[PDB]
C-alpha cells in the first residue's frame, strides 16, 4: 500500500527534535535577511531581495513585505508561495475579529493564530510544514508598537529588534551592540540599513535589492500609517544614511 512512500513528516527524532521543522529552518537560513526594529515612536521593517536582474520589474514587485491589516504588517523569509497561503488566512482572521468585536485585532491574537496554524502542520496530517519565518510589525492600543517573530515550529516571541533568514547571528550581534531603548524611528531606520549593509553576501547595498517599511504615529493626527517605501524612496534614504 501507500505506507511505503510516507516520509512521516510529523515524528520526533531520537533526540526529541522535529526533522521537518529543522530542515525547513535550514532552508530559511539561505533566504534574504529581513530585519525588524521597534522604536518608541514607530517600527521599521527592512529586507534584502534575494537574487536580482536588470529585467526584474521592482515597481510591481513584492516578495518580502506584506500588509496584513491597516495596523499590522509582515516581513517574509523563506518560500514566497508558502508565505502567501499564510498571509491570506491572516488577513481573513483579522477581518473575522473586526466583524465580531468591532475592534481591530490585537497584534498578538493574530500572531498566536498564525503560529497555531504552523504548529498544527507539526503534529498531524502528514504534510510538510510551511518553509516560512515571519517578522510581524504592528500597533494596537494595549501594548503600542510590537514586534514578533514566528517560524515553522509554530513558536513565536517578542523583540525590540530582530532578524530572520541568512546571517541572523551576525545581524543579531550587531543589533545587540547598537540598539538603545530610547531610539527614535529615524535612528532605527539607520540601524536596519547599517546591519543589512554589514551582513549582504553581495558586493554592494543598492536600492534595487531592498524592500522597506515603517509603522508610524504620523504626531500630527492623534492615529497610526504604514509606509511601504517605493524604489525611489529607498534610493533617497540610502543616500541620507551614507551608503549611497
Amino acid at each position: 500500500g501507500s505506507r511505503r512512500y510516507d516520509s512521516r513528516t510529523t515524528i520526533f527524532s531520537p533526540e526529541g527534535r522535529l526533522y521537518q521543522v529543522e530542515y525547513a529552518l535550514e532552508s530559511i537560513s539561505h533566504a534574504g535577511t529581513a530585519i525588524g526594529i521597534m522604536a518608541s515612536d514607530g517600527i521599521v521593517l527592512a529586507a534584502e531581495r534575494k537574487v536580482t536582474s536588470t529585467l526584474l520589474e521592482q515597481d510591481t514587485s513584492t516578495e518580502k513585505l506584506y500588509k496584513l491589516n491597516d495596523k499590522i504588517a509582515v516581513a517574509v523569509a523563506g518560500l514566497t508561495a508558502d508565505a502567501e497561503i499564510l498571509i491570506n488566512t491572516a488577513r481573513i482572521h483579522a477581518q473575522n475579529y473586526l466583524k465580531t468585536y468591532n475592534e481591530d485585532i490585537p497584534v498578538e491574537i493574530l500572531v498566536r493564530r498564525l503560529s497555531d496554524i504552523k504548529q498544527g502542520y507539526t503534529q498531524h496530517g502528514g504534510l510538510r510544514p510551511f518553509g516560512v519565518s515571519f517578522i510581524y510589525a504592528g500597533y494596537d492600543d494595549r501594548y503600542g508598537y510590537q514586534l514578533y517573530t514566528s517560524n515553522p515550529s509554530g513558536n513565536y516571541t517578542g523583540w525590540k529588534a530582530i532578524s530572520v533568514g541568512a546571517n541572523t547571528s551576525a545581524a543579531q550581534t550587531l543589533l545587540q551592540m547598537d540598539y538603545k531603548d530610547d531610539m527614535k524611528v529615524d535612528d532605527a531606520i539607520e540601524l536596519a540599513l547599517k546591519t543589512l549593509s554589514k551582513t549582504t553576501d553581495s558586493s554592494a547595498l543598492t536600492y534595487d535589492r531592498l524592500e522597506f517599511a515603517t509603522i508610524r504615529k504620523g504626531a500630527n493626527d492623534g492615529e497610526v500609517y504604514q509606509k511601504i517605501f517605493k524604489p525611489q524612496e529607498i534610493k533617497d534614504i540610502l543616500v541620507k544614511t551614507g551608503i549611497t
Partner: peptide, 11 residues
C-alpha cells in the same frame, strides 16, 4: 541563547 527580547509582549 538570544537576548534583545520584548518582555512585555513575549508569552
Amino acid at each position: 541563547t538570544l537576548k534583545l527580547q520584548d518582555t512585555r509582549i513575549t508569552p
